[PDB]
Design an enzyme around this catalytic site. Structure first.
Site, PDB file in Angstrom:
ATOM      1  N   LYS B  82       0.813  -1.220   0.000  1.00 18.37           N
ATOM      2  CA  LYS B  82       0.000   0.000   0.000  1.00 18.37           C
ATOM      3  C   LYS B  82       0.823   1.236   0.000  1.00 18.37           C
ATOM      4  CE  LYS B  82      -4.229  -1.776   1.125  1.00 18.37           C
ATOM      5  NZ  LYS B  82      -4.302  -2.911   2.004  1.00 18.37           N
ATOM      6  N   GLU B 104     -10.286   6.477   2.685  1.00 11.68           N
ATOM      7  CA  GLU B 104     -11.134   5.415   3.166  1.00 11.68           C
ATOM      8  C   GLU B 104     -10.190   4.332   3.670  1.00 11.68           C
ATOM      9  OE1 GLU B 104      -9.567   5.432   0.564  1.00 11.68           O
ATOM     10  OE2 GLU B 104      -9.565   3.507  -0.506  1.00 11.68           O
ATOM     11  N   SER B 371       2.181  -9.826  -0.237  1.00 11.04           N
ATOM     12  CA  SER B 371       1.756  -8.436  -0.211  1.00 11.04           C
ATOM     13  C   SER B 371       2.029  -7.736   1.119  1.00 11.04           C
ATOM     14  CB  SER B 371       0.281  -8.342  -0.579  1.00 11.04           C
ATOM     15  OG  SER B 371      -0.513  -9.154   0.263  1.00 11.04           O
TER      16      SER B 371
END
Ligand code: NA
Ligand code: NA
Lengths: 382, 388
Positions: B82, B104, B371
């Site tokens: 991210k 969000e 990830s």
């Protein structure tokens, strides 16, 4: 063997044989091309080395003096510089025909690092840990079990790190034929202080090369927190010969020097024999230490730091619980990096030192780890 | 704006100027020398790129089939891919003259990544989060406040991700003059699905170079987990023209597909519009976004990026499901076997890779996008698996 008068190998005769065997095994593989190919490959693909050298631009402009760089060991696999040591010692032991690793831990952090290395190499791993430490470090204990390690709580005496150390020595003594004792910092009888420092030196060699690339010159000061002292030696050692660089170790000042509740072995302890080595610890027998940073909560300190202090190559100072904690919040808000509370001591003194220095000078801080493990602790405090 | 029939820009007229200004700025800076210099500098010195490609030998041999390599996004600053997107977008917003970031988050991980980036750049950060999701993610929320960001609970609707997105959309509509809306996956109205993918493409570029270097050829399969589809598009994208390279996106199977409790938008969802995009969404007979479940909180996103909908249509990528049970076993398995504790989202990818390799031959290669790291999930896993 020794660093000035400090260091040595003061152990019962039963441990002398195992230690020479470790020392000879190390002498053979240390420079061995194949052993180093395996180690550099694990550090690259598995651990993430090299770690970057980061310019704390905004923090630097805020304080107003020296440029502050962060050696970003917080980004090593596991979140802590201890991985460098554990992944060097583990393959070595497997080359000596050892099928097992043991180790003790207080904060649980070397416990995690050892379990990880063991998983990687498919060795059994048993971790001794005082029962009172076990309760205080619920998440590290779970991490260890997740990695397939067995955690042996020690439910005798003070039920703390001192009791766990002794139980691991008695274990190794019985099982050195197939077991390697993986010591976590630059402490214990020869050859561990040297071995650990050699395996952490990678930090300084990269940092050295990275500051020459970025500033065209060596740093003016290198700051790093000191428990036992592995991250500090790691980053210090490649700069020991370079006279222009000040080395500053930052010990845990706890609730203040005058309170008893601290871990400033160098700054306030006395010389003695402990854990098979001659160095400083708090004391006749060991006296208990304290630090909000759990990794800095160890009665003693490395004999090579004892040496560097004696001959004045390095300066040693303290930072309180309150100071580290503010530096924990400062670096988070200002740089978006949540540091280990151990590392926050270094940061907190780097921030004080920078204020009194020139804008053209350079501090490198060894950010020994990340702050994720410490979030519960900081939430109780704040 | 489109990937075949999916994507678009389904927002009120008020948001069309803001989205043109964003598209105009992105085209100006996307290839700009200084913008990429500064981005690459942050990605190297602050985020820790490149991430290595790691050969999981022990795991590969235990299964006894295809080779399994993990692309180590778990080592990026923050614990998750991210960060790649957040550090792309935040400087861009500053160059646009914005002083505020909003976002969000449902799992809390994107809000952490947004907070970290805003802290670095000295921008205000407001994170909209479903009140039910605030309650389920206390450490990610503490992380955000530690980083200087304000968190704003959302008590409208079902108090979940869906509602946080809408409140985020409503705020930006009012405040777009000074605020950049930092969308955290390959979702949203154009240009966000394109932008987010472009900022995650680095993963696949590094992986492509590393696997050539390590194996002398491309991978046979590439496996990534899919929530909105950020990390999967990132690793997928530089391989899409490589025809022989299979691309597999793994979605959350939850308690089982037949239970309704899952989050497999591509496998079990229907086409709809939400979040200002046309893509696949989980919905009931009367059109409303159904609640999404997964043990992995980051795969609770009740839809999926339109580009994945596009790649699924043309059968360039295959999309599969993996249960909570299966992901949780992979989480334990990777921890014991390679001493790497994965994120529960990433453990979906690993779990599928472990199933797939067993059937394949010993000279075939599988790259798994790992990830994230599992530190954030330990409270979850201790509750699920138990205190051993
Ligand atoms: Na000490
Ligand atoms: Na989805």
């Amino acid at each position: 063997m020794w660093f000035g008068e400090f260091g040595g190998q003061y152990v019962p005769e039963t441990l002398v044989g195992p230690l020479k065997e470790l020392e000879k095994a190390y002498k053979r593989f240390k420079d061995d091309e194949e052993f180093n190919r395996q180690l550099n490959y694990y550090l690259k693909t598995w651990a993430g080395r090299p770690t970057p050298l980061y310019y704390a631009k905004r923090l630097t402009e805020k304080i107003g003096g020296a440029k502050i760089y962060l050696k970003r060991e917080d980004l090593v696999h596991g979140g802590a510089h201890k991985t460098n040591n554990a992944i060097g010692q583990a393959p070595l032991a497997k080359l000596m025909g050892k099928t097992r690793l043991i180790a003790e831990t207080g904060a649980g952090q070397h416990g995690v690092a050892t379990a990880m290395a063991g998983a990687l190499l498919g060795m059994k791993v048993d971790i001794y840990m005082g029962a009172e430490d076990v309760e205080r470090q619920k998440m590290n204990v779970f991490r260890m079990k997740l990695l397939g390690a067995n955690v042996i709580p020690v439910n005798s005496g003070s039920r703390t790190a001192k009791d766990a150390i002794n139980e691991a020595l008695r274990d190794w003594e019985a099982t050195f034929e197939y077991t390697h004792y993986l010591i976590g910092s630059v402490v214990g009888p020869h050859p561990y202080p040297t071995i650990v420092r050699d395996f952490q030196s990678v930090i300084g060699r990269e940092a050295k090369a990275q500051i020459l690339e970025a500033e065209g010159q060596l740093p003016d000061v290198i700051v790093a927190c000191v428990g036992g002292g592995s991250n500090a030696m790691g980053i210090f050692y490649p700069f020991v010969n370079d006279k222009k660089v000040k080395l500053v170790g930052v010990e845990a000042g706890g609730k203040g020097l005058e309170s008893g509740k601290h871990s400033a072995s160098l700054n306030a302890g006395q010389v003695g024999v402990l854990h098979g080595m001659l160095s400083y610890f708090l004391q006749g027998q060991i006296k208990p230490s304290h630090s909000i940073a759990p990794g800095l909560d160890y009665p003693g300190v490395g004999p090579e730091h004892a040496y560097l202090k004696k001959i004045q190559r390095a300066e040693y100072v303290t930072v309180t619980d309150e100071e580290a904690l503010k530096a924990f919040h400062e670096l988070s808000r200002t740089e978006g990096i949540i540091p280990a509370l151990e590392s926050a001591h270094a940061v907190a003194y780097a921030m004080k030192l920078a204020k009194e220095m020139s804008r053209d000078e350079i501090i490198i801080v060894n950010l020994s780890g990340r702050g994720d493990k410490d979030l519960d602790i900081v939430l109780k405090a704040s």
